[model samples]
Target: MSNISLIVGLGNPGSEYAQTRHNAGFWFVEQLADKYGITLKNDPKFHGISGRGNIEGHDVRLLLPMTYMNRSGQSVVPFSKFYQIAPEAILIAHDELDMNPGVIRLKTGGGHGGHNGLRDIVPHIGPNFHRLRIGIGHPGSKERVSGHVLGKAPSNEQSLMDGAIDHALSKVKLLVQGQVPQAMNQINAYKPA
Candidate 1:
């Protein structure tokens, strides 16, 4: 089977953003790297931290874009071109406020659905790529939604997210294997702890 060479995790940069719900994507990839003993070093030209490794025995390039979430396309476009990876081969992990913590959904080829990070990506790569949506649970009001996602996860909610991130990283190989529908079904079935 051919490898799915490009996997980008959407998030903001800096330690201040580390625990925020919006940065969950970055955290997920970091967990995978840690488990595999891989380090993501700064690649100035790529405008992201990236490294290659084997996931479920297939070569993978994991990217954590340094571009702010709203302009994620800046990094992804170049990475995709340099690698010659098609839109179908790229996968993204990002926070979705529609589902509570501990829940995940995988899909392909859709609108950004109010996700700024995804919005930027779709224009550059087109809408035919895959997405791994990890819900962070939205706040009650629209005014607070942004704050909610950008803020640190509640202490009680943190552990559930931590465990889910671990699970998602382990399961990423299923998507890379072109088991998109199956992976979606498997991940979306998970419930919050």
Candidate 2:
């Protein structure tokens, strides 16, 4: 959407959280920042980060809420309101437990599926914005669910994230450009070898 001005990547902060499964949202935005030659410096005022750059020739601002995952709404509400950016203009990147690992999907306004981060955002932004659901897959059973999200991915998973990073970067561009249909069509379309 030409009117889209903000893309918020949801995740917790700190290096320890980096490379962890819950940080895929952060990782995806980091990929876009690098691709656009933009930097996400900490903005204490924003209660998170703010990056200014161009994507597909449109002015784009990227935000990484620092209120951590579960409390993400605190940061998002203010940012979205201050910018006067509509919920429809905001694209959130976060992990999805239902899809296969490394898979990606572009959709909006669905139930939060027990994701607190998204649950928080939905109330503030309305259940009408877009979500780039990056799949990390589910734990084998309910007993392991908590451990799965909080636990770090295996070292071997790094290679998959590398490619996933690039894939996510392209999707961000397409989504921001109001090409969500195309973005949804192509994400995870090519199977990894």
Candidate 3:
């Protein structure tokens, strides 16, 4: 069995955050739910919405925090402790400002790099968890970062972002099975011809 037992998508809760670039992680969670016929329900104990189902023949749990972006770990930590899931067994999907819109990357163990959500998560889960970074691109200036992430992306950018999510979804089974190197090779090599 793979070490990865929990998958968490980091994002702020509610409609205002929906459709914004900051909620790209939430989009991935929805994609997974749709793909697996899972119904994510609110769980106050977890401080989030969660679903459980089999992925690639192994049971996996999916979580979407309701504690807003900066406090994502609040939702993740409780469920993780209850399930006895270690930090290495959790995979967090979140928006990445460092990469271009639509570029998705998978990595393990790193510092938060200024993401408030990641910063909070690190203390609770440590830095050993896996990360699925869904690129939302930068605002071109530090001063504009907040507004950019909080706002809806342009139509063309959104199309690209959607493509990235689809690509990630296609290889999720490989990730769940702990074939991360292979998954990374395949996902990184993908690009429009």
Question: What lDDT, from 0 to 1, does candidate 2 have?
Answer: 0.80
Ranking 1 against 2 by TM-score, winner: 1
Off by over 4 Å in 1: 1-3
Q: Which candidate number has the best TM-score? A: 3
Error of 1 at 66 (Å): 0.6
Query: Weakest 10 consecutive residues, lDDT, candidate 3?
Result: 184-193
User: By descending TM-score, how would the candidates be arranged?
Assistant: 3, 1, 2
lDDT of predicted model 3: 0.87
Measured by C-alpha RMSD in angstroms, how accurate is candidate 3? 1.3
**Per-candidate clashes, comma-separated:** 0, 1, 0
TM-score of each: 0.93, 0.92, 0.96
Task: Judging by lDDT, tell me the better candidate of 1 and 3.
Answer: 3
Q: In what order do the candidates fall by lDDT, top score first?
A: 3, 1, 2
lDDT of 1: 0.83
> What is candidate 1's lDDT per residue for 63-158, written digit by digit as tens?
999998998888888988898899888888899888778878878788999999998888877998888888788889999988998999887677
Error of 2 at 83 (Å): 0.4
